[PDB]
Design an enzyme around this catalytic site. Sequence first.
Site, PDB file in Angstrom:
ATOM      1  CG  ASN A 293      -6.212  -5.607   6.290  1.00 53.46           C
ATOM      2  OD1 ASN A 293      -6.781  -5.382   5.256  1.00 53.46           O
ATOM      3  ND2 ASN A 293      -4.978  -6.104   6.338  1.00 53.46           N
TER       4      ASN A 293
ATOM      5  CG  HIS B 133     -10.246  -1.960   4.933  1.00 54.34           C
ATOM      6  ND1 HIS B 133     -10.047  -2.099   3.577  1.00 54.34           N
ATOM      7  CD2 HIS B 133      -9.005  -1.922   5.485  1.00 54.34           C
ATOM      8  CE1 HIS B 133      -8.746  -2.151   3.324  1.00 54.34           C
ATOM      9  NE2 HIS B 133      -8.089  -2.015   4.461  1.00 54.34           N
TER      10      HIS B 133
END
Length: 850
Positions: free
Chosen positions: A706, A511
């Site tokens: 996400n 991420h």
Amino acid sequence: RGHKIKGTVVLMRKNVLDVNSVTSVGGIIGQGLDLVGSTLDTLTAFLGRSVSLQLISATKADANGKGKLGKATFLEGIITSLPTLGAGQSAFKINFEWDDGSGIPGAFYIKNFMQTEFFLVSLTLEDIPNHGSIHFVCNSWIYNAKLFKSDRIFFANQTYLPSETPAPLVKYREEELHNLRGDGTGERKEWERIYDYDVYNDLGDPDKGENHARPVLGGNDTFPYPRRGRTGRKPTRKDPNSESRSNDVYLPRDEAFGHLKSSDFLTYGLKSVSQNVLPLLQSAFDLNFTPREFDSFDEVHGLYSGGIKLPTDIISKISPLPVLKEIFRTDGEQALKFPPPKVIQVSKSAWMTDEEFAREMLAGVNPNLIRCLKDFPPRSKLDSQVYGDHTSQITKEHLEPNLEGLTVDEAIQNKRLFLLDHHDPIMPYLRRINATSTKAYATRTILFLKNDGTLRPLAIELSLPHPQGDQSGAFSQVFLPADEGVESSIWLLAKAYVVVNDSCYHQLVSHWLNTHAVVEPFIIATNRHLSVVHPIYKLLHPHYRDTMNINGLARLSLVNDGGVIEQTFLWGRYSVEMSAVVYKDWVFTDQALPADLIKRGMAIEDPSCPHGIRLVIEDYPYTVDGLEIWDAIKTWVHEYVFLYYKSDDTLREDPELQACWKELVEVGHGDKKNEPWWPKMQTREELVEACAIIIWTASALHAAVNFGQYPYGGLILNRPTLSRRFMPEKGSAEYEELRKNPQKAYLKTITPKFQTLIDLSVIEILSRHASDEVYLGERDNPNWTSDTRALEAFKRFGNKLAQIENKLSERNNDEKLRNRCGPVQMPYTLLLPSSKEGLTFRGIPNSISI
Ligand SMILES: [Fe+2]
């Protein structure tokens, strides 16, 4: 004949976009009497000697070659209504004296003489000769004219390569590019639009103490890192090489997006969780109105039904917080509630199954890491430490059980063995990590593709550094699946130790590093070197929306010393350093989806197949869905690039594109400047490829990693973020506690109650789409180019995404594809392009916006 050009200016006042004024409580927006400007007359303030516009001719020059200026002209009158006037927009009439001498306007200068800034949306000119309307898309905050040396300039709609720029505008185009670069000096101020680079010397606070110091990331060989946006603050007093801390982090002004609705201010929500919710919740635990520890799984499930009982001392200071009213469910007084995560909405206990553990490596929050095993035993990439010239200690006797009756050599041959390897990044730091309150392992998991098309975990290897030193290899132990008794409880813990490795790798690398950090130097290079008028600037611009804003907030509150990530995740104080170590192995061209699949052995090249590759696991939801979106993006980019570049030579001759990419490689990702894999920008195919990778990274890759964070990991039991206890040994009292009360043993191993509450509060925000999210493909802001060929191509892109959305939904209703849903019955919708607002488990934004 002397004629007036009729202008309409659309703008938005500060009050309608600013967080402090829009906070009452926020529910309906896009609506109202689509705040038609006129009504509530602050609008009359704009109408005197307040705002002046000056047209710049594109076709007629002065003696020294610059486009002829018209007369500075002031806002004349209010337009009350227009068919396309939006919520919060105000419209103004202005008429310009022009004649047939000064030709076609192609730019304008604007001066704001008011005290307060406003957001300029557009200028539209209704003209004089056989010429259509001229449109200008501005989307920019205009601060007081006394703050600037040369005036704010905006160009028309027309897309131009450097060589195609109208001669009278050449100097204007170059001058603004220069003004966007700055000179590399100075402390940056709120109103400035200056794009430049600095290293990550930003995250620690060494003035507060030596243990608050954090190492500089980037500009050295030990910890290389992408650059971030330069802020120009004074150094810390204790260390010259570090930048002093501030509550406000600068970013170039138009990179910070406002919102019409209070609840869309998510970075504000996040900052409030760090600054206001975190110290105040921490006070309940440093007291005792909350017991410190979960005692049962039932107590974890109570977060979603009745919630956690807090005193109304804390509750009344957290519930009326501006943006947080949406995300914090509050019954009245005695409860902070969390919404039920999708993972337990059908079944409370399905996450414990081996098949869901395995499926989540293909369709979960981190679906990107699994590799096909090519040799056995699995090897390490570590250096002179000896287990890395040795191997995994998982043996062939370990892998022969119940299912297919093959040998290990056969199962490798037939590509049925898979590996999730979390051994190497943590190993060099394990001895330091295990000297804190954290107790962790370096893990490997081996998985077998069953006959039914699902994956099954076969063995888990837990490794520790050193009985007698690091040169002595790994101390490893091996755990096998079991469904009954104490051995099943051991196996669930072994699974938790893997997931703890995975969650931390996901947060910092999958991420943070691979989307957020790696993209920021591309935004800086783009603004510095490509004019707003450049075709490739327009191709890339929607994909950068709000990225510098969320990254600036991450530097302040997320990834800083003692911030949310260090307190919540396994790697602790070493978290960001270790991601710099992983960055040593980052390669730009392997971020392309097909290259990644191939590199990990999950696909083989095959022209007989739909996307030119054959998958080794057919039912791999991330990858099969991702390939549809990757191919849609690359087709769009190709059509677009080839509208503008007539040959590879015209690309080689483009000085803006060439300077952009040269600065990207040499400065922005400058610690990797000598790597041989960088595209040279010598061919239109290399431009297509680079642009597709940036857009894939900003859009689909960030969304995939996400938006499943709360739906999968809103149950801390399913995605624990740290571990605190080593495995119970066969005759100790901890093994007996595991025997008598395995839930309590599970809970005292993983993230404690305090850090669970922080984690959940953060990932609930991170997993939410704002109302005003702009999604992949169909969506752009406005009238962004006057090139109808590009508009048509962009429309084809939108249409393909809508077709892909239907195909993806149909795969979710296919009963043969069990990895799409699992025992948890959660249809994989992460790569569905469109979404409503909220915690949806879907929607691909254009950019990294959260
Ligand atoms: Fe993010």
